[PDB]
Design a protein around this ligand. Structure first.
Ligand code: CL
Ligand code: NA
Lengths: 254, 249, 250, 253
C-alpha cells in the first residue's frame, strides 16, 4: 500500500523517502539553517524529503534538563518550515490532547515507541485522519506490529507507516533483525516500512553499514538525525551511497 | 530503607506484603467481593495486604475494552474498601493532572512501566508526597532504575518502591533475572523491592516456582493480578525462613 | 526418577546433593587439600557430596598455557580421591575415545554444554552405562532437552542428570530462567535436575552466588553444582531452604 | 588482508566468492551433479566458486542418521570434484587427527562453530598451514573473534577467514547483527569476512538476509542447496551479484 504525502509517494516499491532532521527544536534560526541544508542536498540528489523534529523531550534523565522549545513555539516553527520550503514535516506527540492541534500543522504525526500501548493516545492520533508514523517498540516482535495496526484500523485510520528502530538484545543493547522488515510487510498489508537507523545504533562508519543493510531489504524510507546523530556535512556523501543502493534494489523485480 | 504504609512496614527485611486485587474497577459490589476474598485469605495467614485496582486503565487489550469506572467513582469505591476492610490500596495513574486527587485517597500511587521515563508524570507523582510504586520497564536494565529514583528525589519524594516485572528475552517472551533484585537494592539505597509475578508472565504451577525463586532473594513484597491459599502458604513459609536469617556476614 | 550413586540418592524430591571441587587438576596434594575441606564441611552439615574436577582445560587462554595433568595422571588422582574419602566423583569428557577409560574410574561423566549435540560423544558416553550429567546449552529452550534425553535413551542409557548453566542474554552475558527447571522436569520424565550456579554467573560476587543458588533451589532441585568460612555460611542457608522446600507436598 | 585460494582472490574489497554445495556427502554421482550445477551457474555469471560439503556430520538429528561417507571416501570424492571441475573445495574437521589428511586434499578447512574454542583442534588446524574458515559461535560476540584469531597466529597460521552464522536471540532462534561484520573487520586486521546465510536462518527470507549482509561489504557468501532450492540458484546469484558489484565499485566511506 502506497501513501501520498502532498506530492510524495511513500511505499515499499517506490524510491525511498528521507525522514530527516534533528533531535529537538532549539530555536527558529537553528532549525531553518538545518532544514535548508537537508532540502538543498536532497533536492539535487532527487530524494523526496520530510523534515523531522521534536518540540519536546518528554523523557530525559533530569527533570531540569532542556526539553526543547515546547508545543506552542514548536508549532510556530513548523509553520515557517512548511511555508519557506514547501515540504511536509513530521513530529511526535506524547499526550492525547496534543494530537488535533499538532495534526492541524504537522503532516505526519508519530507514536513514540514507549507509548505504543497507550490506547487513548492511539485513538486520539487515529481520529485526526493524519498519516501516522508508528515507532516499533524495542520489546515488540515484528509479528505483533499487526496488533498496533489493528487498533488504528478499528479507530478508522489506515494511513500508517511502520518504523523499525531495533530490538532489545540483553541489557542496554539493540540489534536490528533484518528479517523483521519482511515479517512486517507480510503481516501488516504491505504498509510502508521505514528504518530509523539513528535510534537503532544505541558511529559514522557503522551508521552507513546498518542503513545500507536495512535498505537492501527494499523499504519505503530511511529515518535519521544529524547534528550541525550523523555529522551534518557528511549527509550528501552518506545519501549518495543510500540512493545508489536503493535505486539498484528498487529496479529489480520482486 | 523501610516504608511505613498505615500500620504496615514494607521493607526487604520485613515480612512480605501481598499486593493484589482486580484489573479494572467496575462497581462497589464487584470490588468488595473480590477484595473480601483476598482479605480473608491473607488475614487467615497473617499476611499484610494492599488491594490493587485500576480506575482508568490506559494500556488496554483493545480500544473499546472498558477503561474502568473513572476517577470520581473509582475514588469513592477505594474509600469504601479502606473503610470496610481497614487496608491500604494502590492504583496506577497515567495523567499528571490526576495524581493529586487520587493521592487524597490511594495510599500508594503506581507509575506504569511504559511511562516510567515520562518526566511530567514522575514530577506530578512525586509532588503528591505519597508512597510510589515504580514498575521497571522490560526494556530497562536493573542498573538504570537509579535514574528514575534520582528524578523522584529531585522532585522531592523518597518514598519509593521498585517493582520487577521481567526483561525482554528474544521475541515475545519475558525472563526474570534473579540477580536484578540485588542490583536494584545495591544501586537504589535498599529501597523496598517487590515482584510482579503476574506481568512477568505477560503475553499456575509455573508462577509458583517463579514467585518462590524471586522471594528467595529476600524481597519486600509480591505483586499478583488475580487456589490463593495454597500458594500463599508456600510463599509465607519461604519468606519466614529467609527473613528469619541474617544477611550474609 | 531417582538415581543411586553409591549410598547417595539423587532426585528432585530428595535432599540436595552438592557437586563441588576445583576447576582443573594440577597436583595430587592440592586436590586432596580441597576435597578434604568440602568433605569436612558437608559432613558436619549432613549434605551428600560428590567431588568434581576436570583433568583438562579444553579452552586455554593461550596455546602456551598449562592444560592440567591430562587423562592418565587425572584418573590416578581421582582413584586416590575415591580411596581416601570414599565419595563419588564427576568429571567432563571431550572426546568419544576418552569415555570408557574415564568411566572406569569416575562415577559420573559429564557432557559439556557446547558438545551437547555431538552425536559421537553422546553415543560413546551412553555406551559406558555410567550416570551422565547433561549440561544444557546456553541457546537451547528447556523443552528441547527432551531431544538430548531421547538420544541417550536410544543409545541405552537412562541414568541422566540435567544441569542448568544459564541462557545467553545479549553478548557476553547469561540469565537463568527460573521457569526452565519445571519445564525440564515435566518434559524429560522428572529426571534429576541440578543447578550449576558457578557457570551461570558471568557482599559482592559471593552475595550474587547465594541469591542465585537460593532462587534456583526454591524450585525444588536434586542438586547444586559449584566450582572467612564462606562455603559453610553458604551451605547452611541452602540446606535450610532445601529442607523447607522438600518438606512441602508437590 | 586478502587470501589467495588457487586462482581466486578472497577479500572484503574483492568480488564476492560463493562458498556453496551441500550438507553431507552422501554419494559420488549426486555430489557431482549438484556441483555441476553450481559450476555452470557461477561460470555463466563470472562468480568465483568454492564447493562445500561435510564428509562427517558430527551434529545429526538422530544417533543413527547417516553421518556421511566418512574421511577416506569423502576425500576421494573431493579429489574427483577438483579433477572434474578445477575448483577449490572446503570441508570441516572435528578432530586433530583429521587435520593433516583433510588439509592435503582440501583448499579450505573449516573449524565448526561449536568447536571454535577447542585449543587442541585450533593448534592442529593452524599447523597444517592451510587456509582456515573460522565459524563464529552463536553464543560469542563479534569482538571476541580476535581471541580465536590470536590463538591461530600464535600457532603460526594467518590465512584465516571469519564466518558469520548468527547470534542466539531468546530461545531456539538466531538474529544476525549487521554491525558485527564491521567489528570483526576492525578488531581482526581486516581478514576476509564471509556470511553463512543458510545456518543464520533458525526463501525470500534468505534473499533479504543475504542482500542485507552483502551490503556491509563482505568477501563472500556461504550457502547450501537441496537450504535453498537448486534450480532457483541463478536468479538468487543474479541479485546478490548486482548488489555486490555496486557496493564494491564504490570506495569505502
Ligand atoms: Cl554455534
Ligand atoms: Na589443502
Amino acid at each position: 500500500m502506497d501513501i501520498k504525502i502532498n506530492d510524495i509517494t511513500l511505499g515499499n516499491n517506490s524510491p525511498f523517502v528521507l525522514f530527516g532532521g534533528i533531535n529537538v527544536l532549539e530555536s527558529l534560526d537553528s532549525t531553518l539553517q538545518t532544514c535548508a541544508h537537508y532540502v538543498e542536498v536532497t533536492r539535487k540528489l532527487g530524494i523526496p524529503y520530510i523534515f523531522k523534529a521534536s518540540f519536546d523531550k518528554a523523557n530525559r534523565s533530569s527533570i531540569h534538563s532542556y526539553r526543547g522549545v515546547g508545543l506552542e513555539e514548536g508549532l510556530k516553527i513548523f509553520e515557517k518550515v512548511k511555508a519557506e520550503f514547501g515540504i511536509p514535516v513530521i513530529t511526535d506527540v506524547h499526550e492525547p490532547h496534543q494530537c488535533q492541534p499538532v495534526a492541524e500543522v504537522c503532516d505526519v504525526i508519530q507514536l513514540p515507541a514507549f507509548l505504543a500501548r497507550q490506547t487513548d493516545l492511539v485513538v486520539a492520533m487515529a481520529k485526526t485522519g493524519n498519516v501516522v508514523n508508528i515507532k516499533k517498540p524495542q520489546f515488540l516482535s515484528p509479528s505483533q506490529m499487526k496488533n498496533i495496526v489493528e487498533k488504528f484500523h478499528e479507530a478508522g485510520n489506515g494511513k500508517l507507516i511502520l518504523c523499525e528502530r531495533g530490538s532489545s538484545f540483553g541489557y542496554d543493547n539493540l540489534v536490528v533483525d533484518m528479517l523483521g522488515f519482511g515479517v512486517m510487510k507480510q503481516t501488516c498489508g504491505n504498509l510502508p516500512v521505514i528504518f530509523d537507523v539513528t535510534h537503532s545504533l544505541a558511529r559514522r562508519a557503522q551508521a552507513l553499514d546498518l542503513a545500507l543493510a536495512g535498505m537492501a531489504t527494499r523499504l519505503a524510507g530511511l529515518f535519521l538525525e544529524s547534528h550541525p546523530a550523523l555529522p551534518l556535512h557528511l549527509l550528501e556523501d552518506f545519501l549518495i551511497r543510500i540512493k545508489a543502493l536503493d535505486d539498484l534494489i528498487k529496479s529489480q523485480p520482486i
